[PDB]
């Protein structure tokens with residue numbers, strides 16, 4: 001049912017750098033994950049331009065933000081192109097090995113962690129606030145998978161038989177104990193307004 | 209030999225807005241075109257991860273900047289994934305119709321033209337400095353095409369029989385008469401250093 005994989009050495013090193021570096025401006029994770037959602041949404045939209053049946057799995061192109069104080073999770077859902085099993089395994093559709101190398105040569109040259117997205121590995125900023133991350137995804141050319149990691153050098157992939165989602169990607173952030181401010185409506189609103197004001201898809205902040 | 213197409217109404221409107229709006233910070237075009245080259249390069253690299261024969265048409269992943277004062281052109285070449293004929297026709301692989309709409313709702317809300325790339329239509333900033341633009345491209349799954357436009361509502365596409373390039377995209381900017389500062393080594397260097405310092409591919413500035 002569940003396969004376990006090792007992160008390539010460079011990705012594991014990126015993940016330790018994000019987890020262990022003292023760095024206070026953690027809120028940029030939300031921008032990186034929304035921006036990722038926007039890229040996936042752009043992709044399904046571009047595909048629908050020549051093949052409208054690509055949208056048979058859902059015409060709505062949007063991003064939802066769902067906080068849950070009881071489970072201590074912030075979930076980001078989008079109706080973008082989604083990922084195949086192979087995409088999930090190859091670093092969630094990123095060029096993360098070379099992107100990590102570039103990012104680290106910048107960090108030497110003075111840059112800081114807020115610029116991680118410029119190197120294509122913005123996802124991993126999720127580990128600034130999350131102790132575990134679960135990625136649930138559905139691409140038109142494959143079944144629904146769940147990817148999951150709590151860092152420490154490994155991730156899992158399983159075929160997800162739970163809630164079918166049609167098409168897209170759901171990112172569930174199991175928040176660190178001292179990071180529950182990102183479940184507060186006021187705070188999420190503030191971050192979205194600050195860093196994500198010109199995203200070309202509706203972003204709905206669910207309430208509790 | 210040569211097909212002529214009309215820009216969708218919204219793209220034509222974007223192109224008039226870029227050409228006719230008084231706006232002095234024109235140098236951002238280079239950043240947008242390099243960043244486009246970087247995205248294409250990321251794509252061929254991601255593809256090679258699972259199918260290394262994708263790089264049979266060239267293993268080198270780079271961006272060259274070639275000024276020519278005699279022809280009055282700045283050319284940007286990259287060895288990225290390239291575009292099929294259909295990509296060229298569908299707004300150079302962009303979601304330009306919806307991206308233009310978003311960009312224009314931002315311009316109402318106070319944003320300026322330097323943020324065009326946040327809406328996926330950064331290419332068209334080329335018309336801040338160029339009176340004509342020629343895009344020559346080669347994707348693994350198709351032949352070599354040349355796209356061309358001097359705005360005014362139309363572009364052409366032809367199958368390019370001239371210099372074969374293996375794989376990638378070449379953007380040739382026929383500069384406006386008052387915009388020849390972007391052929392000066394000092395100036396191009398300055399712009400690349402300012403706006404394009406963390407691009408994960410070597411950028412070579414050719415000399416004359």
Ligand SMILES: CCNC(=O)c1n[nH]c(-c2cc(Cl)c(O)cc2O)c1-c1ccc(OC)cc1
Nearest residue numbers: 033036037039040080082083092093094123169
């Ligand atoms: C290749 C076809 N699929 C995709 O590209 C895709 N599909 N879903 C996502 C995606 C990834 C993350 Cl991490 C996220 O938070 C949201 C997403 O939609 C992505 C995705 C993958 C890689 C990215 O690198 C910047 C950004 C988004």
Ligand SMILES: CCNC(=O)c1n[nH]c(-c2cc(Cl)c(O)cc2O)c1-c1ccc(OC)cc1
Nearest residue numbers: 241244245247248288290291300301302331377
């Ligand atoms: C779908 C497969 N091909 C590509 O995506 C592609 N190939 N070459 C380019 C490209 C486009 C421009 Cl305008 C440029 O200046 C440089 C490029 O490499 C692109 C490209 C297309 C769209 C883009 O939108 C941001 C950015 C780059």
